[PDB]
DNA sequence: CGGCTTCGCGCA
DNA sequence: TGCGCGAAGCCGAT
């Protein structure tokens with residue numbers, strides 16, 4: 001579909017048909033940004049070829065009721081800033097509400113759209129909406145991978161067992177797909193309220209807030225400022241101040257040495273490809289360079305690979321054969337402690353470091369990367385069944401994490417609980433052959449006591 | 457056969 | 469803290 005600085009492998013056809021004489025419509029779902037957006041850039045390319053400007057649509061689904069205010073305000077505030085950035089380029093953004101399978105298909109008919117383009121997401125709920133709107137339209141369906149540097153259907157054609165088998169595949173395609181983003185061209189001709197949906201939603205999830213003893217909200221919303229502009233400042237501060245000391249302090253939660261990009265990376269408010277471009281050109285510690293790149297290239301995009309080829313990514317069936325047999329044998333093992341969902345949620349466990357890990361999650365909305373494994377592995381060790389452990393982990397992850405409901409989370413949880421993209425270890429009770437993490441192991445690697453006192 | 461993200465453990 | 473080893477199952481280059 002035309003284009004010079006345009007790789008056709010980033011885009012794939014989902015439904016062929018006659019191209020309508022109306023404007024092309026971009027169904028923004030996962031990448032909520034104007035700059036460095038392949039799906040938006042590709043929508044403008046066909047816009048110029050057909051001499052019809054691009055319009056952007058968005059559907060607000062009730063999946064927000066499953067999460068909390070922290071993710072709702074972080075997402076709506078970025079959309080208000082996005083609405084004014086697209087308006088400066090003469091690109092109108094339309095914010096629908098309801099079922100995407102019935103609202104997107106309808107909006108195509110009333111607006112008489114000429115071409116429909118959407119972003120890529122390996123989640124189950126994304127494929128269900130696509131199959132419904134396909135059966136209700138006749139204009140094309142082009143799906144562009146604007147999140148990953150290398151498209152998911154191009155990086156690997158099967159479920160990759162681990163990273164050492166996926167690392168060479170990704171790095172070999174890097175010189176072809178790691179490129180610079182062309183500038184978003186504004187529209188030639190020009191031819192639902194964000195302020196009201198925010199206040200309507202907030203009053204809905206108000207009773208479901210996470211409160212303290214004195215009816216005080218636990219969440220602290222001054223840690224991460226949402227938006228595209230604020231996301232860029234986070235990257236520049238990470239590269240200039242934290243990139244050098246990443247490789248040595250990436251596993252220490254007492255020091256804020258992480259990029260803190262996951263909330264912006266999940267909602268699409270910042271492009272991972274842009275971060276790699278700025279990182280690759282940066283002159284920093286080579287050890288820290290590869291360590292950060294492997295996290296945002298190999299492990300970030302294997303999560304999409306795991307959720308794209310395994311529909312049951314959040315279930316016990318996606319676990320490898322060795323892990324399923326080990327956990328099935330240890331189902332009758334007596335657990336040293338048994339905690340329900342309410343006790344895990346409120347930090348009512350005998351482990352102060354697990355409670356501190358939960359306390360950081362409740363207050364800041366972003367647990368440290370290293371403590372997320374201990375927070376997840378101890379859940380399996382202190383649960384009725386491996387299914388109940390997976391139930392609690394996903395529920396507590398998708399509810400309070402600013403980067404929840406992401407393939408990065410489902411793959412990360414399956415690694416800690418089901419050994420996905422991992423190997424077997426010493427045989428233990430309850431845990432089985434799954435990788436084991438202990439309190440004493442954490443004490444020798446970082447100052448645990450400093451982590452506890454910070455979060456009570 | 458070699459080697460696996462992030463494991464624990466003994467010992468400078 | 470930093471290093472080498474242990475315990476475990478299996479992909480994939482041959």
Ligand SMILES: Cc1cc2nc3c(=O)[nH]c(=O)nc-3n(C[C@H](O)[C@H](O)[C@H](O)COP(=O)(O)OP(=O)(O)OC[C@H]3O[C@@H](n4cnc5c(N)ncnc54)[C@H](O)[C@@H]3O)c2cc1C
Pocket residue numbers: 250258259260261262265266295296297299300301303367368369370372373376397401403404405406408409410412413415416
């Ligand atoms: C049990 C568990 C649950 C997780 N839940 C989520 C989640 O809900 N949402 C989420 O985005 N990630 C999740 N992670 C993955 C990882 O912990 C986070 O991406 C990271 O901690 C976010 O902090 P950061 O961006 O500052 O880390 P950084 O060190 O700055 O990481 C840079 C980027 O690399 C990617 N990345 C980092 N660590 C991992 C990892 N272990 N696996 C895959 N990609 C990674 C992310 O895109 C991240 O933004 C989870 C991991 C585990 C083990």
